[PDB]
């Protein structure tokens, strides 16, 4: 998917000087490139950056919303500590069944707990937990319509100092539309405007893939 | 300076949804915008990302190469722990004198140790130190001709797990030139190619400002 709004020629170069995916990440991405939905997955550049954040941050407790075939979860899982844990939320049983196949295949399935079913229902159960779980990092990358909800609910399930990571903030450049007619564009426009003055977090909008925002909880 | 190779219209939006600089950072950047060289400074987006990395990483020992009027050093310094320290290296006494004026003015001059004189001479003294200093993060942003040296020397002065940050890796898009005639372009082209297969680090090329690479030491 390259980089939204980035020069095609400069993106090719950026790729030239970027790191290849490890074996199983590359394999997962390579073997499923044919199946529909593959374009929804984060780019290889985002996966590398994502794994770099798990390491740099020291994260052990991760919460992913929007799993699909497990590519992003796998990227992070490969950098988790021996006691690292990922709670993966996804509504699709078929794509997620493929995710499970590759996680166990890479030996990180032990560090990933898939929660099949609507993400909101799962978040509600997490907040209803005794004691209240608190993740070091949360990756929001599912249905855009519910981003405001996932951010808010996840923000209280995030430790102070934790990092929220949201994908698709530049939404194919549609965010520049004056009167957006598409629902996801409208929801993302308001989401970005709201987050730009959310004084509970210190943010950084990064142009990798379809745009990703890093929100560090104060 | 926007973002090298990024859409001007999308960059304006990205700015719209980005965080403003704190008082003294904005003030420093605002009051010196008239002086020559101001365009060399990292963009506001990079400063925000830079401060976010100091926090997320837990860095206490920082090494900056390429100080100028102190903007980047100030961005990082404002996020340092009470015991945080920055060793700032710069050859220019006049621009650096202005840097000092703003650091003390923001109350972080206590956490910044300016080393005036050729960066190589200063790095040589740091490596000649007893005991050998080891930084958590190193920001290389000076004369491009010496990037290979600053990276190599700094890499051994960096702790394992530490983070190397290099600016200007996309060098005004000149990195795409087939037969670059400019020295900095040639040096940066080789630098990026060498770093892309440097197995001592895990990298990520980020398109913010004039391109910045994050190299996490294994
Ligand atoms: N309401 C909902 N609850 C849970 N999952 C949902 C959902 N709406 C959409 N999803 C999931 O959101 C996912 C977005 S694609 C995720 C891609 C993955 N992060 C990667 O980069 O590899 C889809 O798999 C879809 O099944
Ligand atoms: N050989 C050398 N040794 C030390 N400093 C050098 C040098 N060559 C260039 N420099 C310094 O490299 C700096 C690059 S500009 C630095 C901008 C600063 N990082 C910011 O973003 O605010 C200049 O101030 C120049 O004085
Ligand atoms: C459903 O959520 C997503 C949708 C897309 C769609 C991409 C495209 O249409 O090319 C991409 C990434 C997503 O996370
Ligand atoms: C000397 O090092 C630098 C030079 C420039 C030049 C920018 C321009 O010419 O517009 C920018 C950033 C630098 O770190
Ligand atoms: Mg996405
Ligand atoms: Mg620079």
Nearest 5 degrees, angle CA B60-CA B197-CA A53? 40
**Buried (b) or exposed (e) across B124-139, using 16+ Cβ within 10 A?**
eebeeeeeeeebbbbb
C-alpha span between B8 and B202 (Å, rounded): 30
Resolution (A): 2.0
Could you tell me which residues come within 8 angstroms of residue A136 by beta carbon, excluding any fewer than 6 positions away? A57, A58, A59, A60, A61, A62, A159, A162, A163
For residue A131, which of A150, A157, A161, A160 has the smallest C-alpha distance?
A: A157
Boundaries of domain holding A72: 1-218
Contact A71, A28 (CB under 8 A): yes
Could you tell me which residues come within 8 angstroms of residue A41 by beta carbon, excluding any fewer than 6 positions away? A1, A29, A68, A69, A71, A72
Chain A contact probe: residue of B8, B14, B175 with most A CBs at under 10 A: B14
Contact A29, B23 (CB under 8 A): no
Tokens of B40: 């060399």
Exp. method: X-ray
Q: Exposed/middle/buried for A103, CB within 10 Å: 0-12, 13-18, 19+?
A: buried
Closest-CA distance, B195 to chain A, in angstroms, reads 8
A 12-51 residues with CB < 8 A to B: 13-14, 16-19, 45, 48-49, 51
Measured N-to-C along each axis, helices A183-195 and A147-156 cross at an angle, to the nearest 10 degrees, of 40
Residue with tokens 């090298």: B4
CB atoms A173 and B7 under 8 Å: yes
Ranges assigned E (strand) in chain B: 61-65, 85-90, 112-116, 135-140, 158-167, 201-206, 212-217
Q: State the pairing for strand pair B212-217/B201-206.
A: antiparallel
Count of domains for chain A: 1
Residue A155 phi, psi dihedral angles, 5° rounding: -65, -35
Chain A CB contacts of B5 below 8 Å? 6-7, 10-11
List the CATH number of the domain containing B102. 3.40.50.150
Helix%, strand%, coil% for chain B, nearest 5: 45, 20, 35
Kindly give the residue spans of alpha helices, DSSP state H, lying in chain A: 8-16, 23-31, 44-57, 71-77, 93-106, 119-127, 147-156, 183-195
Question: How many Cβ atoms from other residues are within 10 Å of residue B48's Cβ?
Answer: 24
C-alpha span between B218 and B216 (Å, rounded): 6
C-alpha span between A173 and A4 (Å, rounded): 7
Q: Exposed/middle/buried for B179, CB within 10 Å: 0-12, 13-18, 19+?
A: exposed
C-alpha span between B187 and A199 (Å, rounded): 42
Say whether residue B57 is in contact with chain A using an 8 A CB cutoff. Answer: yes
Rg of chain A in Å (alpha carbons): 17
Cα dihedral: A19, A50, B147, B29 (round 10): 150
Q: Is the C-beta atom of B4 inside 6 A of ligand 2?
A: no
Q: State the pairing for strand pair B112-116/B85-90.
A: parallel
Q: How far is the CA of A15 from the centre of ligand 2 (A)?
A: 28
Strand, helix or coil for residue B12: helix
Cα separation values, B46 from B17, B91, B109, Å? 14, 23, 21
Closest Cα in chain B to A56: B57
DSSP secondary structure code for residue A209 in this structure? B
Cα separation values, A206 from A196, B82, B149, B208, Å? 13, 28, 28, 7
Strand, helix or coil for residue A120: helix
Tokens of A87: 């709670």
């Amino acid at each position: 998917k390259g980089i939204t709004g980035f020069d095609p020629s400069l993106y090719s170069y950026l790729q030239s000087i970027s790191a290849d995916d490890s074996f199983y990440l590359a394999q997962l991405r390579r073997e499923t490139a044919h199946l529909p939905g593959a374009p929804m997955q984060i780019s290889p550049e985002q996966a590398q950056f994502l794994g770099l954040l798990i390491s740099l941050t020291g994260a052990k407790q991760v919460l992913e919303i929007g799993v699909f075939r497990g590519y992003s979860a796998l990227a992070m899982a490969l950098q988790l500590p021996p006691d690292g844990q990922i709670i993966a939320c996804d509504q699709d049983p078929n794509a997620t069944a493929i995710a499970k196949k590759y996680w166990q295949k890479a030996g990180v399935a032990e560090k990933i707990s898939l929660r099949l079913g609507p993400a909101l229902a799962t978040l509600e159960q997490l907040t209803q937990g005794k004691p209240l779980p608190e993740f070091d990092l949360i990756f929001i990358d599912a249905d855009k319509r519910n981003y405001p909800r996932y951010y808010e609910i996840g923000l209280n399930l995030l430790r102070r100092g934790g990092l929220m990571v949201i994908d698709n903030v530049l939404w194919h450049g549609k965010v520049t539309e004056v009167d957006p007619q598409e629902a996801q564009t409208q929801v993302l426009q308001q989401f970005n405007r709201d987050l730009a003055q959310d004084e509970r977090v210190r943010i950084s909008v990064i142009p990798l893939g379809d745009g990703m925002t890093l929100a560090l909880k104060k």
